[PDB]
Amino acid sequence: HPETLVKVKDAEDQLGARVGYIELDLNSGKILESFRPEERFPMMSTFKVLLCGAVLSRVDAGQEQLGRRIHYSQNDLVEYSPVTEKHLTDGMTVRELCSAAITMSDNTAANLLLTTIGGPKELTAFLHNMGDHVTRLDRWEPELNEAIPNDERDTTMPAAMATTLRKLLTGELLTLASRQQLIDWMEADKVAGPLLRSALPAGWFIADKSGAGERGSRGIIAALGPDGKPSRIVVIYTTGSQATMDERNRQIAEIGASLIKHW
């Protein structure tokens, strides 16, 4: 809805930064609405969904186990390791790691998982194989959140990320069981409260993943819909603002409010 585009532009004005936006029909893959769909934005922690996706494909293929336990040490600990830092002694399973990386945005959990699949280059190659020739992971946590202007490293495009997420959630790429596992993690998200979630009406379905970074970067990817089921993919990225975290949260939630309102 064009009225949503009005809010998006309003957001750019409010934040004094670029905003990338996309609304995608889950079933058909049709673009319902877009704003700078083909400009690059830093993915930040939104990439964690893609990471667990690659992990799940490995599991499906017998190359990995959800139950496998990983034993890391204090040396692996990076800033923003709310969960990992609590299990230093016993380690954590692949399952718990994906859960932490997604539901809590745990940075260490991501690096550990990155290691198991062969690093950024491997994640990148996974994406490329599934038809996404744009999205790219170049660094590890937490350097990937650098967001230097004009840098292509660790970026995606709103259209690329939307279509990729769609393939992941509804394609033949993952077994049905893995798909669900993926959705289950996004659904249990615990740090995205002040974003789309704040405008969501009761009884609606939401599976999402947020992210933040330097240079006022903030973003969210999500599958949502009325009646406990998703029917649309929404991707929102911003970068360059000198605004506070709170002001960035508000604009995102206001965009959400508009999209819901004009559903």
Ligand SMILES: *[B]([O])([O])[C]([C]C1=[C][C]=[C]C(C([O])=O)=C1[O])[N]C([C])=O
């Ligand atoms: B992520 O954006 O790569 C990473 C970890 C992260 C920490 C706190 C809150 C969020 C969010 O809103 O989802 C995160 O993603 N960001 C940094 C700066 O390390």
